Curated annotation (Swiss-Prot), chain B:
Key word Transmembrane helix present: yes
Annotated positions of the Phosphoserine modification: S150, S184
Residues shown, of full length: 413 to 795 of 883
Tissues and organs where the protein is expressed, per its UniProt entry: Detected in forebrain. Detected in dendrites of neuronal cells. Expressed in the pyramidal cell layers of CA1 and CA3 and in the granule cell layer of the dentate gyrus.
Residues glycosylated per entry: N3
Protein name per the record: Glutamate receptor 2
Induction: Down-regulated in the pyramidal cell layer of CA1 in the hippocampus by global ischemia.
Lineage of source species: Eukaryota, Metazoa, Chordata, Craniata, Vertebrata
Disulfide bond residue pairs: C206-C261
Highest rank taxon of the organism: Eukaryota
Site feature: Interaction with the cone snail toxin Con-ikot-ikot: R64, R148, K240
Length: 263, 262
């Protein structure tokens, strides 16, 4: 039938999507800015659709409740038909690929360690062999699931600690984890994706640091409900923009051109 | 219908697929070893099929002839039905995605610069601003197409030089490019994927070096003919192997555990 406006689900996560300082004087898609706002405009132009950005109602990425088997977050909005596409830093994972479709990745990343500068930690092994410094992850995301499922000795030891730590070492948002690092005088380290870690490293007050190599290698993809007619075009659009260098330009724009910790 | 042995097309490219030292007394899949031989075995086990490794007839990855529009290499073997799956360091690209299916990537890479140690080159910009040191790429692959299509000033300038340089700066195989670097006393630099560059850096005689950052960011995928019934399972198998750490284990096995340069 007639063309319909595509409902995009996304998440308030810097620098991917944020509200403009003057958002109350703006309308619709113009209220937002960031890497994924820029990417959404390009995907829509190349695939030939109009769209509406919406922020995921529960503020989560997406996980399946073991008891109810209900998906939450952006994944849930696609699974239950509340959104037509997700354009966000949404990690491609096996369990998600079983229930939604993903484009080829638009950004590479791996799990990484964020410390407050001066913390005597250089690696995941370092974290796993000590107890003075607490550490945790985001809730309802792919990093928590990585540790929950890992059979690698170091990462399983970390999970055994994190799942039982009291008070909870897990946080509701990336911003909460960063704030916990910054206020803990070196006694909390945060496990988060290298993309978000590298962004925060270039933000005032310039007191955090990414240390060690990444723990895994994966990517973010644009997600659609399984079998959606948009998937083929969106996948080709990602590859076209990748090959033309747009994805590299956008990363530089939102990570480094606007960095606050020097050149 | 009944299960059929899956025909795998792949390519002799170290350390992905190589003939074993004792290959002349071996038969079938046992003749070969490497990262992609191990990966094929894992994919087959998780997807539940038997398979036969075959080396692509023309020794190429795959490009489309501009005049006839016919695909060569492994891509062609999939397009024309000569193979059921390609398990190789085959780069995911737009033009290929139009004619074959790719899994999610099993390895990350980008285009990179290989020099003979001591060559006064640190970047693509350095190459583009001089003429004493020649440089080129593999034929019939994704790196040549990258330069052919780039509108980035430095890379467009490099393509203008490469497309007309005499003698030809292009090579038919990665091994020919590496040999050209090693024998040119620093007057040839080779543009190739970072995976292959980093492998060669750890091989005797330890006289090459990867320099500069990568020029792009992309990945290798397992490829199937469009609409093949194997595609969905193979894609999930790649993600499972990724999440289990198996892909990382295999890279360490074939790049670094037996590196020869310390
Ligand atoms: C940014 N970009 C443009 N798109 S593309 O040419 O398809 C492409 C392919 C691969 C990567 C390297 C980073 C990565 C992303 C995703 C995964 C990985 C590894 N591996 C290694 C396991 N598989 S995965 O899909 O989680 C980046 C990339
Ligand atoms: N990108 C992650 C969220 C961040 C994290 O888990 O570290 C996801 O899609 O679940
Ligand atoms: N991996 C490349 C071949 C190597 C190259 O072009 O540098 C391809 O799939 O074409
Ligand atoms: Cl058979
Ligand atoms: Zn506000
Ligand atoms: Zn209002
Ligand atoms: Zn565009
Ligand atoms: Zn929504
Ligand atoms: Zn240590
Ligand atoms: Zn103390
Ligand atoms: Zn355990
Ligand atoms: Zn202090
Ligand atoms: Zn600030
Ligand atoms: Zn760093
Ligand atoms: Zn296995
Ligand atoms: Zn040109
Ligand atoms: Zn000399
Ligand atoms: Zn040798
Ligand atoms: Zn190096």
């Amino acid at each position: 039938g007639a063309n319909k406006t595509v409902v995009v689900t996304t998440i308030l996560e810097s620098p991917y999507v944020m509200m403009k300082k003057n958002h109350e004087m703006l309308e619709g898609n113009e209220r937002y800015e960031g890497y994924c706002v820029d990417l959404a405009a390009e995907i829509a132009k190349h695939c030939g659709f109009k769209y509406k950005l919406t922020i995921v109602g529960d503020g989560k990425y997406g996980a399946r409740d073991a008891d109810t088997k209900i998906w939450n977050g952006m994944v849930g909005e696609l699974v239950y038909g509340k959104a037509d596409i997700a354009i966000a830093p949404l990690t491609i994972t096996y369990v998600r690929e079983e229930v939604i479709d993903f484009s080829k990745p638009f950004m590479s990343l791996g799990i990484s360690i964020m410390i407050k500068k001066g913390t005597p930690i250089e690696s995941a092994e370092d974290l796993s062999k000590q107890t003075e410094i607490a550490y945790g992850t985001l809730d309802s995301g792919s990093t928590k699931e990585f540790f929950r499922r890992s059979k690698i000795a170091v990462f399983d030891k970390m999970w055994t600690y994190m799942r039982s730590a009291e008070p909870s070492v897990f946080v509701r948002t990336t911003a909460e984890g960063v704030a916990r690092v910054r206020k803990s005088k070196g006694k909390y380290a945060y496990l988060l994706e290298s993309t978000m870690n590298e962004y925060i490293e270039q933000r005032k007050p310039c007191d955090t640091m990414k240390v060690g190599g990444n723990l895994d290698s994966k990517g973010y993809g644009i997600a659609t409900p399984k079998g959606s007619s948009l998937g083929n075009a969106v996948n080709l659009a990602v590859l076209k923009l990748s090959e033309q260098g747009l994805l590299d330009k956008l990363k530089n724009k939102w990570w480094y051109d606007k960095g606050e910790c020097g050149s």
